[PDB]
Design a protein around this ligand. Sequence first.
Ligand SMILES: [Ca+2]
Length: 186
Amino acid sequence: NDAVSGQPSIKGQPVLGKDDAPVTVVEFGDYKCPSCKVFNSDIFPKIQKDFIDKGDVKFSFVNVMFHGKGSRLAALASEEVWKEDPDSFWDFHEKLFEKQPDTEQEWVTPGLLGDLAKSTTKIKPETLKENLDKETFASQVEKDSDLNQKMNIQATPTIYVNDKVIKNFADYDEIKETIEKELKGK
Ligand SMILES: [Ca+2]
């Protein structure tokens, strides 16, 4: 019972990279997941430099709600930023991962998410916090959950390179070789 092979739709999802990029890399991730924190800091920047910057890869992130209330809070904030200030999205996204502590207990609060909105985006802290309380963007989180279920996501992060499921998100050799093989095929 593993993640399913196939190309996940990135329609309506956050995207980084050129429209015409031949390879689509999708991360199914959770802002509270410590392995997603590692992916963010250690692996993603290499995909950026090696492929996204040169137009070979377009990258997308889909929310997965594996760590309870705080995962949902963070996802709702993330969805609002993508809608209201997409040019700032990836700055907010990276800084939220950077804020994840190496401790077990809950850490995600409206206050915390407001502060990030303030430092990285055009969006007003009180606006974001109002929408979190109202769960204004709930439909987007449910959309992501539907997609997660469709793809049978088991653990975060799960990385797709076109229709190929990466076995180890932390193995840059696997990711790089798989990107390169998909590029060749295109
Ligand atoms: Ca989404």
